[PDB]
């Protein structure tokens, strides 16, 4: 495919799901070979591996004194529309989390798309790779497009579930919210995160039940988002991704770890 | 004690706890003899039992198509302050829940009363009565002054704790917030309430934690709210109470079922 980019300016506002902040983005076209990079407080901050400084419960960036947190599900999108040259402005210290999925960004990036004459430069995944870190793993090795699987195993009612992502098959995961169990929000509150969270923005799951009166989307949206946001953290590599990866009970942590790892290996 | 009213109009705005909607409050000084009163959309709703309307997670009025949910807190603080003439206009349809508690009124109220030249004619308790309600039981004695103790018998870690208010110790309750249990907020959203709710507004309590992270304000704040509750909810009777009640696992549905089987005694 060829690089592309927005048509014009397209801006987003909202709440930060950690913060309880309020953010501005400002999503600015670029030329060709530019690539993704946000902009806070005039400072750029590249969409790279290199520049993550927190991967607890959202992938955060910075760089001199400047930092924006939460930049996955932006990138995910992002990646998911193979837009490759963009400016996105933060005003703030971290990206709105809106409806808590990727739809919102989706839904507007699409419109907005501008062909550019110049091939994509994609990331190939050349061979076998392997990560752990206590029970946690995820299993990486080379494919033609960009397959990715997310398997959980939950200690609620959800239970063993999995789902598989491929090219072509956006729509069904741009959808995917946020989730937490409920033995999942005092730590998180405690521990200075979550200032945004609500039944609005996160999907809140008990022991056996499902806090949030809207129900579940999908039977299993939290795989998906899970899913949803290791490409989002793919697309650290500098480009869009073309490999087939497997994650078994995986997280921003991990994820972030294979990345690097994976980067490590001059490919 | 003297028949009392605010000095000048006071006003408070928020969400409603239920309802999820924006309401404003303006409290008027009223003539004496007046009593306590509701106004919206130019009906007046006078805080006595007659016009209750619905008592599940709040005490609700009504007359002549014009509703206002939640007003146990706001009636509650004017019972503990003695103020008997004012009017309480609502712009909406339920007073705000504001933090949960009846600090913010208190507060204010009590810098702007006013004496006036009319001694309040109390409603006594003449004599013993009960009312119970499966395991629920409320107990009304005769007593000098005000005097109200709550029982609980908590399922979770909080288990049987009771506390006891005396004339002279508004201060102990009128700060107490308004609390669940993660075991239905489920139910709640479902029923269609609560659509306000948030940990800013609410003391949500766990099966053995507290998910706010600012923790208890007393060790027995829910049982104390409780208490603030029924004395509210005691104010229908059209004017300041004097009795002794002991209130055991009970709620504003038994609240007003006494309050009601207490005033069909013509007392
Ligand atoms: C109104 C009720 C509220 C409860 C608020 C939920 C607390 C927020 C928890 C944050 C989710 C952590 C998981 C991170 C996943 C991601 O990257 O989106
Ligand atoms: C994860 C959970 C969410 C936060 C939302 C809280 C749900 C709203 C609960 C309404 C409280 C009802 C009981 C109080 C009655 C009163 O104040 O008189």
Redesign the interface.
Known sequence: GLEKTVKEKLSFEGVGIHTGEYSKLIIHPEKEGTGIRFFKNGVYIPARHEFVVHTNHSTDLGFKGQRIKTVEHILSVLHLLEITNVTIEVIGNEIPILDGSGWEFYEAIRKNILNQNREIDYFVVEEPIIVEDEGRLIKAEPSDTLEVTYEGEFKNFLGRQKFTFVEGNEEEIVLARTFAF?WE??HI??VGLGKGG??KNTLVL?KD?????EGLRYENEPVRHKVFDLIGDLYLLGSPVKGKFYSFRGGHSLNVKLVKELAKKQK
Chains 1, 2 share one sequence.
Do not use: R, T
């Open positions: 409920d929000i005092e509150k405690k609500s039944l008990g039940k499902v806090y949030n009166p």
